[PDB]
Amino acid sequence: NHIIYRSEELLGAASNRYNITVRVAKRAKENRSEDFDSIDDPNMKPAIRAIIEMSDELT
Amino acid sequence: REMAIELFQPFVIHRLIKLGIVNNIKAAKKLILKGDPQIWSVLEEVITGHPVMLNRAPTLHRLGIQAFEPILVEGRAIQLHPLVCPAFNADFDGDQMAVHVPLSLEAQCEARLLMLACHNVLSPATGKPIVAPSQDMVLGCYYLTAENPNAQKGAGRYFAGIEDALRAYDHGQVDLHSQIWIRHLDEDVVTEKPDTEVIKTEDLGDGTVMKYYRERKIREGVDGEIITQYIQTTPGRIIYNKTIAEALVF
Amino acid sequence: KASLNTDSFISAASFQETTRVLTEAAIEGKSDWLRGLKENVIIGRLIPAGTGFS
Amino acid sequence: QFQIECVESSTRKNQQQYSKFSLEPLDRGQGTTVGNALRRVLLSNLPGAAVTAIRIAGVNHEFATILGVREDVLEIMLNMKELVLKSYTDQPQIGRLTAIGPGTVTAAQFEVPSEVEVIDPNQYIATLAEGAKLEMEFRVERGVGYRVIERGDFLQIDSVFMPVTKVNYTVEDIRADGMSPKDRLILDIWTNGSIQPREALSEASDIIANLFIPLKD
Amino acid sequence: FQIECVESSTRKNQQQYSKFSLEPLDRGQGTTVGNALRRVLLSNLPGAAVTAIRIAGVNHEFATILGVREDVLEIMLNMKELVLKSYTDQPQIGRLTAIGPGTVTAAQFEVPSEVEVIDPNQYIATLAEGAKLEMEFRVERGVGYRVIERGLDFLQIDSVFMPVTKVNYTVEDIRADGMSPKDRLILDIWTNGSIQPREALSEASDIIANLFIPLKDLN
Amino acid sequence: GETPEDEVSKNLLREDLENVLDTLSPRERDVLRLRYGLDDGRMKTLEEIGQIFNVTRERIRQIEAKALRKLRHPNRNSILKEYIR
Amino acid sequence: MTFYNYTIDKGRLKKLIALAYRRYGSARCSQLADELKELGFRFATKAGVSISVDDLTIPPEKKQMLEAAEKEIRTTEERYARGEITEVERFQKVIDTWNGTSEELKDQVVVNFRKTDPLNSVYMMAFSGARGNMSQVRQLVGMRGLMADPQGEIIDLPIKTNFREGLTVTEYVISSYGARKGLVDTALRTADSGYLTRRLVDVSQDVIVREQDCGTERSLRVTAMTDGDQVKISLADRLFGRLLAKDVVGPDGEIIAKRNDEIDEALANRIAAVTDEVYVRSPLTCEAARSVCQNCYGWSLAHGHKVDLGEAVGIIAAQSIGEPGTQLTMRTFHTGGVFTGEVARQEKAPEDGTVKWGKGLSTRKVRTRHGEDAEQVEIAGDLIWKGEGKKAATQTYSLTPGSLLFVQDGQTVTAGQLMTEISLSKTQRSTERAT
Amino acid sequence: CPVETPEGPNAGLIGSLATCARVNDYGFIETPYFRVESGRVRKDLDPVYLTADEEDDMRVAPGDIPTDEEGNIIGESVPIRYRQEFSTTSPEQVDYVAVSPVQIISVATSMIPFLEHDDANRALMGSNMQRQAVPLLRPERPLVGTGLEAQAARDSGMVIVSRTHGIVTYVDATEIRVQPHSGEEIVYPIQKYQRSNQDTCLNQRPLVYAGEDVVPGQVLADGSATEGGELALGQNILVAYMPWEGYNYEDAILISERLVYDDVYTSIHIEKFEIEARQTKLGPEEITREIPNVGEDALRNLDEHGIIRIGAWVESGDILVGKVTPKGEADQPPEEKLLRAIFGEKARDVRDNSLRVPNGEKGRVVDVRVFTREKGDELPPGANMVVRIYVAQKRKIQVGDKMAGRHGNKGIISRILPIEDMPYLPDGRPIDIALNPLGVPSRMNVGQVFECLLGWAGENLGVRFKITPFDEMYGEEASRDTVHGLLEEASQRPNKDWVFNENHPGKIQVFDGRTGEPFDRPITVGQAYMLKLVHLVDDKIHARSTGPYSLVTQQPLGGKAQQGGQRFGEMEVWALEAYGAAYILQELLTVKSDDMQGRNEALNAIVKGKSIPRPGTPESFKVLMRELQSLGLDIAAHKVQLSEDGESADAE
RNA sequence: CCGA
Numbered sequence A: 001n002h003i004i005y006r007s008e009e010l011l012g013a014a015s016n017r018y019n020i021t022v023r024v025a026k027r028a029k030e031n032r033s034e035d036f037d038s039i040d041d042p043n044m045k046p047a048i049r050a051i052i053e054m055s056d057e058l059t
Numbered sequence B: 001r002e003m004a005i006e007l008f009q010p011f012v013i014h015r016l017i018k019l020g021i022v023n024n025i026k027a028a029k030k031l032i033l034k035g036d037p038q039i040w041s042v043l044e045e046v047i048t049g050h051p052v053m054l055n056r057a058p059t060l061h062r063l064g065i066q067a068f069e070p071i072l073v074e075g076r077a078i079q080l081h082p083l084v085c086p087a088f089n090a091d092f093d094g095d096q097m098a099v100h101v102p103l104s105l106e107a108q109c110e111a112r113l114l115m116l117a118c119h120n121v122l123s124p125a126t127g128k129p130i131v132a133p134s135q136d137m138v139l140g141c142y143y144l145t146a147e148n149p150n151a152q153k154g155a156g157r158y159f160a161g162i163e164d165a166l167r168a169y170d171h172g173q174v175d176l177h178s179q180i181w182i183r184h185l186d187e188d189v190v191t192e193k194p195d196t197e198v199i200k201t202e203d204l205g206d207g208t209v210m211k212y213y214r215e216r217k218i219r220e221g222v223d224g225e226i227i228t229q230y231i232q233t234t235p236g237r238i239i240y241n242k243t244i245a246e247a248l249v250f
Numbered sequence C: 001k002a003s004l005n006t007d008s009f010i011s012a013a014s015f016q017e018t019t020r021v022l023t024e025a026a027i028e029g030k031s032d033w034l035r036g037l038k039e040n041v042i043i044g045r046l047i048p049a050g051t052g053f054s
Numbered sequence D: 001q002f003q004i005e006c007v008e009s010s011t012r013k014n015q016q017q018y019s020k021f022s023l024e025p026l027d028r029g030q031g032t033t034v035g036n037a038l039r040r041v042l043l044s045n046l047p048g049a050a051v052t053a054i055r056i057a058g059v060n061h062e063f064a065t066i067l068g069v070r071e072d073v074l075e076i077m078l079n080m081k082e083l084v085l086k087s088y089t090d091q092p093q094i095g096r097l098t099a100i101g102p103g104t105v106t107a108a109q110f111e112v113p114s115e116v117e118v119i120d121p122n123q124y125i126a127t128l129a130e131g132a133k134l135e136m137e138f139r140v141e142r143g144v145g146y147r148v149i150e151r152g153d154f155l156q157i158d159s160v161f162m163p164v165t166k167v168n169y170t171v172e173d174i175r176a177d178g179m180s181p182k183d184r185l186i187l188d189i190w191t192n193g194s195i196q197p198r199e200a201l202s203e204a205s206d207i208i209a210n211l212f213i214p215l216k217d
Numbered sequence E: 001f002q003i004e005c006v007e008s009s010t011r012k013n014q015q016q017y018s019k020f021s022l023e024p025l026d027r028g029q030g031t032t033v034g035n036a037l038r039r040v041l042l043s044n045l046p047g048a049a050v051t052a053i054r055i056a057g058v059n060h061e062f063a064t065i066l067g068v069r070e071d072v073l074e075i076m077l078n079m080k081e082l083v084l085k086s087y088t089d090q091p092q093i094g095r096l097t098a099i100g101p102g103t104v105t106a107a108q109f110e111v112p113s114e115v116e117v118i119d120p121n122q123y124i125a126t127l128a129e130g131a132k133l134e135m136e137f138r139v140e141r142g143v144g145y146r147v148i149e150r151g152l153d154f155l156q157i158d159s160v161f162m163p164v165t166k167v168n169y170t171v172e173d174i175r176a177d178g179m180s181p182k183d184r185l186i187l188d189i190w191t192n193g194s195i196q197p198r199e200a201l202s203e204a205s206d207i208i209a210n211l212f213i214p215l216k217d218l219n
Numbered sequence F: 001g002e003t004p005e006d007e008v009s010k011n012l013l014r015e016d017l018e019n020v021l022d023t024l025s026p027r028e029r030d031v032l033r034l035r036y037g038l039d040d041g042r043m044k045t046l047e048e049i050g051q052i053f054n055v056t057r058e059r060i061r062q063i064e065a066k067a068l069r070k071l072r073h074p075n076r077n078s079i080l081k082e083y084i085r
Numbered sequence G: 001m002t003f004y005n006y007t008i009d010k011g012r013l014k015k016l017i018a019l020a021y022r023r024y025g026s027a028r029c030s031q032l033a034d035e036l037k038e039l040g041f042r043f044a045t046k047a048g049v050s051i052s053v054d055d056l057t058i059p060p061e062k063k064q065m066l067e068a069a070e071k072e073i074r075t076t077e078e079r080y081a082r083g084e085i086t087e088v089e090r091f092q093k094v095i096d097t098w099n100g101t102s103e104e105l106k107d108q109v110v111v112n113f114r115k116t117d118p119l120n121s122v123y124m125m126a127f128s129g130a131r132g133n134m135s136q137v138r139q140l141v142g143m144r145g146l147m148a149d150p151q152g153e154i155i156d157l158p159i160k161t162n163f164r165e166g167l168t169v170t171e172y173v174i175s176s177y178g179a180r181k182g183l184v185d186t187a188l189r190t191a192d193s194g195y196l197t198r199r200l201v202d203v204s205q206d207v208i209v210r211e212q213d214c215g216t217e218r219s220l221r222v223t224a225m226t227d228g229d230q231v232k233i234s235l236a237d238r239l240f241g242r243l244l245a246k247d248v249v250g251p252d253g254e255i256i257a258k259r260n261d262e263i264d265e266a267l268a269n270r271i272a273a274v275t276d277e278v279y280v281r282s283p284l285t286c287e288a289a290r291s292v293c294q295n296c297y298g299w300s301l302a303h304g305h306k307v308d309l310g311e312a313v314g315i316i317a318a319q320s321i322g323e324p325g326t327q328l329t330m331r332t333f334h335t336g337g338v339f340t341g342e343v344a345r346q347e348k349a350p351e352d353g354t355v356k357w358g359k360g361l362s363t364r365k366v367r368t369r370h371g372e373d374a375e376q377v378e379i380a381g382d383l384i385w386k387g388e389g390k391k392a393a394t395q396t397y398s399l400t401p402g403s404l405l406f407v408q409d410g411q412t413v414t415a416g417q418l419m420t421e422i423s424l425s426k427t428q429r430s431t432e433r434a435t
Numbered sequence H: 001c002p003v004e005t006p007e008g009p010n011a012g013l014i015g016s017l018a019t020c021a022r023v024n025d026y027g028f029i030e031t032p033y034f035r036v037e038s039g040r041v042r043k044d045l046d047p048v049y050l051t052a053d054e055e056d057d058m059r060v061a062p063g064d065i066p067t068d069e070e071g072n073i074i075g076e077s078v079p080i081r082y083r084q085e086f087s088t089t090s091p092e093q094v095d096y097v098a099v100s101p102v103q104i105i106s107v108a109t110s111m112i113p114f115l116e117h118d119d120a121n122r123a124l125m126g127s128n129m130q131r132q133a134v135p136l137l138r139p140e141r142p143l144v145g146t147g148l149e150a151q152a153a154r155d156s157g158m159v160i161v162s163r164t165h166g167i168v169t170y171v172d173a174t175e176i177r178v179q180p181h182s183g184e185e186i187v188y189p190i191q192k193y194q195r196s197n198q199d200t201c202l203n204q205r206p207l208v209y210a211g212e213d214v215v216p217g218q219v220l221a222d223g224s225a226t227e228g229g230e231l232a233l234g235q236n237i238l239v240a241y242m243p244w245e246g247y248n249y250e251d252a253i254l255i256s257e258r259l260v261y262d263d264v265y266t267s268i269h270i271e272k273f274e275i276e277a278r279q280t281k282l283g284p285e286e287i288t289r290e291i292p293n294v295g296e297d298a299l300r301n302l303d304e305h306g307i308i309r310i311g312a313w314v315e316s317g318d319i320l321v322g323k324v325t326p327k328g329e330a331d332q333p334p335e336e337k338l339l340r341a342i343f344g345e346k347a348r349d350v351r352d353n354s355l356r357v358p359n360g361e362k363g364r365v366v367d368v369r370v371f372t373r374e375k376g377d378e379l380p381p382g383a384n385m386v387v388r389i390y391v392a393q394k395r396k397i398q399v400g401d402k403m404a405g406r407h408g409n410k411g412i413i414s415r416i417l418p419i420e421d422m423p424y425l426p427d428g429r430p431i432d433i434a435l436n437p438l439g440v441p442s443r444m445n446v447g448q449v450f451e452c453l454l455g456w457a458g459e460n461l462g463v464r465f466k467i468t469p470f471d472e473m474y475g476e477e478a479s480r481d482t483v484h485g486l487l488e489e490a491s492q493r494p495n496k497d498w499v500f501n502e503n504h505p506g507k508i509q510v511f512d513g514r515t516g517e518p519f520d521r522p523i524t525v526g527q528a529y530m531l532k533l534v535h536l537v538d539d540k541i542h543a544r545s546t547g548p549y550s551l552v553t554q555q556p557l558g559g560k561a562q563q564g565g566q567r568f569g570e571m572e573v574w575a576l577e578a579y580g581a582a583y584i585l586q587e588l589l590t591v592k593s594d595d596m597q598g599r600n601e602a603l604n605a606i607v608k609g610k611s612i613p614r615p616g617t618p619e620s621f622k623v624l625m626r627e628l629q630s631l632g633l634d635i636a637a638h639k640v641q642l643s644e645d646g647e648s649a650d651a652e
Numbered sequence I: 001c002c003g004a
């Protein structure tokens, strides 16, 4: 339930709701390409981790 | 579940090879169709965090397609949340809904950040909320906060705040519609036909004035202070406001 | 009438009266510069609104 | 046949304990039975202590104002009804209070006997002004249930014997390899601070077991 | 605090009614004891039932036997309603040889020692003048309702294992010059005949006691 | 037509086949690749391998025979044994 | 926080959800709606609310109301046979008589619910907004009144029974007429709704927000929409998501808001409590290359802030216009097949007296649609009821230009006579020529 | 009938003949009427059957006017129809009167009791849902009916009717023999588990025993939705009009497990599968047991010819008929050539073409009839042999199934509760079904409460009432007075006085199954007659990953039978455009339909866990370009780059 | 033809 709070605080503080979506998708693609090894966890998807990291840099 | 093994089949096939269970698509398809308890745990860890678009025809406006996070239920019908039902114009007497799975990562980030159902409260035509209680929650909140002259057990008793009356209701001391005085020092009180005029005044000693209202009793100081305040209410209204207060401030 | 008098013959042909719109577009020799939501859906591109805007 | 787990245990600074319990695995329908019986026995039949009669020297009648104190006698009774304490005697005990202003009056200014014990020491009672001093005596009782005094020597006040303030329970389904559908009982207990939520579970379980053991013949 | 059986009337074997009285209890404790007893008596009591049927010359459930008025489906529904009592926890085997004409009842069942039939006047089938019905069934024990698995020549029955059919209770008050008043619980138990209501009450009582003792012990 | 599932299965079969063949000796790997058209798209005879090289076609048949015997080993070759239909 | 010491219905829950979507966001608002959902489910299950046959309580004034109605129809048709009225005003008179008796019985049903049993199940379902209008409760308790043809024509016969008492065979055929209306219209007018929606989508599929500001000085004047003396949309609702183009000044002289300032409900109430005419920025007055800018459009109503670059506002506008017509066309059969009409307001005298002659009013006698000769007001003037009270019996009615008068200059008024009535609006009457 | 009509586009076009209607020799519809002489309904001989000769000539009254028995028409005003106008006249001016109050309605609408207390749209919905009920395993007559059930069962044709007087001599499950007395043995065959057009059961059961007299017209055997000689479409279950914890929220339905384990609402459905061994140019198709790529224990149920046996259990994917066809192209890629070079792997000349069970559709095989041309049969041309397989299954009630009453109150089952969790009565009996009370006053079908209260009075009495519609001709509030008087007489039983409360008539006290506490308000309980409809969830659930495609457009097919995809129409495109979501819309239009390289690349990227590449031009746009070029239009795409225009090739 |  924290990921919808982070998504709401990431959308509310963005200058454009359509540019922040493309930036989250680009960071999620980088997170998926950098974690290409199989040592991972199913509860932390690349898009969820990108939203978490971008909300943590947002503060 | 049988709908979910079909829609998420290449994502399951990718996970069965990444986990070292099988080695190709043919063994993965064979283990998927043959039935295994490993497939259900694999599908449970595959659909976690993957949003799913739901659609009901006719799609008359924007809220006819919304995104959801799926959980695996057993049976054959799709379980829909009762608050998104006016947005779809959907009741449970024969409606069917289509299901769509986004594949790309840009398409999953768009279903989550732009189309997820917990961000679609307001209508796009008006500014008014679509997501609101209806048809049984409205009746349940109306019965909870109504007046009832028949159910008056422990009426007119004094309680030391909200938690004291909530403890008295769960202990079986008062009814749900009993007239109850509550010590409540806040002034943000809204009533039906709101009253601000004083009905009567009883003077006490030590320069203390006891002001009477229709649904309030205020005791204040002589020059520059307010001491205490009592509010006549029902326990069901106290339950409603405790629900609002623990939902909002968190 | 305002839907059929647009600058794009693909949208006006996909809306209504395909034969007349295509005949006047073929005689006038007009080009479709793919400016709108309906043309990019037929072409198969990103629509120029929303997340495909810039 | 089942294992009981303590999931979390929180304690607020005003001495109020909260503990979540997990019970698994139960058969189909037994979780609702155990949860409803435990909730009813935990809220209705569990002995605790409270104050029953106060006696303030210098009052006219039951509904009046006290000289020098901001709080009149009605909110004095309402503040004494909030007083959380525990006793170890079936016989009456008498607590006393002396205090002088200016300043606020807390629960730590009671020189109550050692057979009773005050749970929340920084419990607000009254405020004083201009060096006026207050003298009162209250009577501690233990019991079960509640007493409501009609129309408002010792001045009998409303009493509530309730060591557990709130019990919630939810049941979760367990689907596994076997065909047996099972149940998981999630229990939440909120206590007054007098006793623990873990030992209040044992008291209610003892009450239910002593209720149902002589029926088996 | 004593139990007391008030009225215990019976049918042929079909219903065994009993009314038990419980006094004294506290105010909410009558409702706690009554609802826990009702839920356990209706849900968690084990009994015996027929789980499979094999008929000679019958392969599927949609067949017929010459000279029998009922098909295999109505025979399986009639054997689904059979009232038995099994003293063992092992699957037993019952048999039947019947030669028409006549009415085949439950008294004609050749059963083993551990399985005995409660109602012997219970209807099974009707046989015509040149008929021959030779069948063989299986008796097991279970709790609640059994759903069939995935499907030699045994036709499976989704058997029900509830011997107690109806539980009702009311709570009465005792008011006198007897402050901190008490409550009285009266309990109505109806069974199918395979278990007595007193034995069913004892089974529900020690099931509830075994549920609530490790909560007190392990804390 | 051909389904996308058959396309992806034969592409993964091609990738696993090339990754299995490049583990053995480099000469027999390209002999087997030019024999069945895994690089040229043209299946060739035994003699034309003898014109790709200059050693004639009798050594070529023994080379592909021992390459098939090495790939028919029970150990370290069962990754390809799951594609058996 | 706010305590809300009153009874909760659907509109107040909508107000609470709309308030929680001002300072908390979307997710906290959805969590609040989730908690209110489970609370309402729990206490609706705990209540045990149920509907029975005896729960439908018919008021005991229905007999005398129907008797007064048939006496009015009887004196209407006695007036028709004598020769001083014609057939079309007789038709209009009997139709308006049965419609007024149906509305009077509906009001009496609501009053009898509020007086005797306030916690009635049908009254709780209709009054809280849970399910059901007052038209359906009028059909269950009261009378059904008049039905309608599948083409919109009006039938001639009344239905003097409700669903609790049971209809007769004649009344069942008359109700089957309106059922066929609802079924045929649901089957046949949704194509018109969907064709209008497709045309509206195709006319504005290229209206995207491309730029942030166009830099224009043109503005749109916004007033409160009124049809007669009562408002329809107020000024504060009409200034809800707009930007300002001119500064709003008060009577003291302080500027309430500057130009290019986004208006919310608080600023809209602050503006609408001062003036009556506001100049805003609109897409009608935007100067952009075949599109709209960010400042002339204003707010995204689904989100609560200013719009974003690249929003397809034409698709949202076409869907917003095309959704309610299609939905209402497909749910027209919920009302049975009855005729819905707007009753014109009448202001009567409570007791005996006369009427003050209005000052500053000229009037002409204009033949009413019902048959009685009445005088229509030209310039609006006051009217005061001259009661026969020695201390205080006086009521004043200010007229609308276009009202009708059944009272002469200084004539003595009987006990309960008809006094004044304003005629309907153009769309609120919904009439067309025939033969 | 003004009520019974389709709801779709053909509303008002397809009508239904009324109950007493009849078509004369010239083709016109006529209706019977009783004569009226001097204000007295005659009723002495046969009626008149006026063929619309009653508009310009006669004053006709309906059959619900009050009339004292063997006497005149009471009242001084009689409602008549005259010159296609409704009016009121004196009883001495009435010419004709109707013969029945249900003369205006059809048969299925006459099946509905308390019809005059319901809305007409709900009566239409009740008739339509009554025509959609499945025949159950143990059918049961309604406790409240109207009276046309016996005639409907007699005239449907599902009931074996006797013809002569006689004595029944032999009864079994397949034959009833009777000698007639008033070529001396009449043998009535009884059909057993046949298939209807809608894959439902047509089963008959004997009712008479050996050795009893039989009158002509006596029901000897009753059909599938018929018991006791009368129509029996559903069961009588115990309702409580109350809300549960959101489980009957918006026309959803809460039921108990007793309707599962007691075999209530269990039905039989028989599916039919057919396979033809065709003649191909490359060789004849043969039905055999030797199938390639099929294991060991997948052939246990097949016989020596490769066909299943009677009485075998089959599930989804099991082989019904093994068939092969001689493929003869043999164009193998290098991967398959190398894999058959390594591991042996001799490729066979036939391929698998067997008949298999579809997804779901488990059941028992009951009929395996095989047709061969040299056995005496003659086939469709080009087919060697034809095998027909009938598979039967017993379907219990399920979450997602549709359920309805006779008053247009449909609903979907959303939760099945245990009986210790269901609410119970003050005799301890749990409730079978909880219906939401808010669906009654908005939909305006009040007759269901009348029906449930009368059925509960008849349950506590044991009498099985029968009430004709429009019963308010016998007095004011006749239905209400009948229902409450019968409830009072049922409550006057020596043990059942909790049945009726005079303070609140239709309601009694209901207790909660979970807590034991009574609910705060009394709840209307009753016995309603609920139906199970053909719309079951097994025929509705469908999903596709990747299946077949269309010929020209190369888009996915449509339909459940061909594993088709859902149509993402133009309104869904507008809904995605009103959001942002340009990438969702682009992948929905390209890599999920008619872009074949994008299809293959997207599937390979998802399987190998990599990024899905950028799509290309969809296939249907190139089809449109070629079609516009074939119309004679020089249409082309151009590309500008560094002061240069060039025509692009979209076919690539 | 039916269902939403």
Ligand SMILES: Nc1ccn([C@@H]2O[C@H](COP(=O)(O)OP(=O)(O)OP(=O)(O)O)[C@@H](O)[C@H]2O)c(=O)n1
Pocket (backbone or CB within 6 Å): B057, B058, B089, B091, B093, G186, G187, G330, G331, H443, I004
């Ligand atoms: N020709 C039709 C018929 C129905 N619908 C859709 O199906 C829904 C029908 O709802 P339904 O449940 O059949 O009826 P309700 O309106 O719910 O009324 P009731 O509850 O009385 O059945 C409508 O909202 C409409 O969106 C449609 O699009 N086109």
Ligand SMILES: [Mg+2]
Pocket (backbone or CB within 6 Å): B090, B091, B092, B093, B094, B095
């Ligand atoms: Mg619906």
Ligand SMILES: [Mg+2]
Pocket (backbone or CB within 6 Å): B091, B093, H251
């Ligand atoms: Mg509906």
Ligand SMILES: [Zn+2]
Pocket (backbone or CB within 6 Å): G213, G214, G215, G216, G285, G286, G287, G288, G292, G293, G294, G295, G296, G297
């Ligand atoms: Zn602009």
